[PDB]
């Protein structure tokens, strides 16, 4: 009995305007009709405008590494007019031993070098060197990895939205989808002023996926959101930190990096929690404090910036890109967890390609990703 605008049709529908849904929309909107309904006023207010905006392959299992590895062609060279400035700036990560785990570091190393062949292997002298706030007596050697970068997030989040627009797709804000129906062949998505509907579903939803099979009656993948708080902070008088890399512990217990004139800090938490607007909680802050006070000379005064955000895994701590099984039509872009952004132009474009029913690029082939890396059945027996 209320007003609804007439059924919109389209190609693709993809739930989300985070990193996913916008990568993978991105790479599908030359091919056919693009819908992206967005919950919120703006299409990065949830992880992908919380992130540490770091590019770190040796990070995570190993199909993470090489969705990581695959999509630095996309952020060194993208296409002409799809941003005005270079997506990536240098910043090296050092992983620092603070543990005295030396086996621990030498497997890191090895892993890590057969990755990226310029990964190094540091003594504590040689970490102290390179970010000469830490204190020597907690340093037990590092691994330096030249290749890291920072990511510049918002440009190539616009990018690839400004991309879907331009090939005539809708990026529509403050249109959450508040139920989905198969209805006459089609997945079909009613938000708050009309519908919408397509033979596929991309469910891009970030920490929501499970929530948005659950509008679905699709069997979800149980999908964890973790909070990992960060915070801002003035270097001391005198510290010149610009140039600083990226500095993680071993054991992921903290990092620390520049951003701009100023730095970031992480207690590097994982803790799990249920899919909302998340918060910084003040034991998340003190405690990446009290770490970095610790390991270095550091003092922190108060913080000019607190966020907390969420980085989604299943089991396996692998992402998810593929239809659903027995579920025609629904397409899972999920489980980024703690690596959307560096991995997004091989996800995006990998997922475009399996949801068109295409073979993987070579180039995703040839840095060893196939589809059932990807596919959510192998989260099953
Ligand atoms: C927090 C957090 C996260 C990272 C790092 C730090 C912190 C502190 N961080 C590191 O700590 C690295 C170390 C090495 C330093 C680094 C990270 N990732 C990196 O690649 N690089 C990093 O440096 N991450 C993870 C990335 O942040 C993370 O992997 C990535 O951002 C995940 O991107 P999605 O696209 O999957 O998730 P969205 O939430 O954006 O978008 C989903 C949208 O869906 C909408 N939505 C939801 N429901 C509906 C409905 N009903 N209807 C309609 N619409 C609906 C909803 O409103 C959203 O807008």
Redesign the pocket.
């Known amino acids: 009995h209320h007003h609804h605008h007439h059924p919109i049709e389209a190609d693709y529908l993809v ?8 990568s993978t929309g991105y790479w599908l909107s030359a091919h056919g009709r693009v819908v992206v ?4 006023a703006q ?14 392959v040796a ?1 995570g299992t190993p199909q993470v590494r090489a969705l ?1 590895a695959a999509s630095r062609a996309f952020f060194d060279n993208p296409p002409a007019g799809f941003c005005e400035h270079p997506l990536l700036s240098p910043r090296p ?1 050092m992983v620092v031993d603070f543990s005295d785990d030396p086996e621990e570091l030498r497997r890191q190393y090895e892993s890590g070098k057969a990755l990226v062949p310029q990964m190094r292997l540091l003594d504590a002298e040689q970490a102290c060197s390179i970010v000469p706030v830490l204190r020597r007596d907690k340093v037990f050697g590092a691994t330096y990895d030249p290749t890291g970068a920072d ?1 510049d997030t918002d440009a190539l989040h616009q990018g690839y939205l400004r991309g879907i627009r331009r090939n005539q797709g809708q990026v529509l804000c403050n ?4 139920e989905i129906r198969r209805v006459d062949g089609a997945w079909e998505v009613r938000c708050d002023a009309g519908s919408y509907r397509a033979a596929v579903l991309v469910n ?6 499970d ?2 099979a659950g ?1 679905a009656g699709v069997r979800p993948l149980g999908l964890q959101p973790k ?4 915070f801002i902070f003035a270097p001391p008088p005198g510290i010149d930190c610009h140039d600083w890399p ?1 500095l ?1 512990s071993l054991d992921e217990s903290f ?1 620390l ?1 520049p951003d701009a004139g100023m730095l970031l800090g ?1 207690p ?1 938490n994982a803790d799990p929690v249920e ?1 909302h607007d998340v918060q910084p909680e003040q034991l998340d802050i003190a405690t990446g404090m009290y770490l970095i006070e610790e390991a270095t000379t550091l003092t922190i005064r108060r913080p000019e910036h607190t ?6 895994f299943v089991a396996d701590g692998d992402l998810v890109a593929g239809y659903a099984a027995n579920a025609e039509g629904f397409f899972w ?2 489980a ?9 132009a091989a996800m995006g474009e990998a997922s475009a390609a399996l949801i068109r029913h295409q073979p993987l690029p070579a180039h995703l082939r040839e840095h060893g990703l196939d589809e059932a890396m990807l596919s959510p059945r192998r989260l099953s027996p």
Do not use: D, F, N
Not at 37 to 40: F, K, T
Not at 204 to 209: F, Q
Not at 227 to 230: D, E, K, L, N
């Open positions: 739930i989300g305007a985070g990193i996913a849904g916008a309904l967005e919950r919120e299409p990065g207010y949830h992880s992908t405008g919380r992130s540490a905006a770091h590019y770190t990070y990581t990560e990511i249109h959450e989808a508040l891009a939803a970030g920490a929501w996926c929530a948005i509008l909070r990992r708080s960060a990226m993680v990092y990096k992480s590097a899919a966020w907390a955000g969420l980085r989604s872009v999920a980024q967890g703690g690596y959307g952004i560096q991995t997004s």
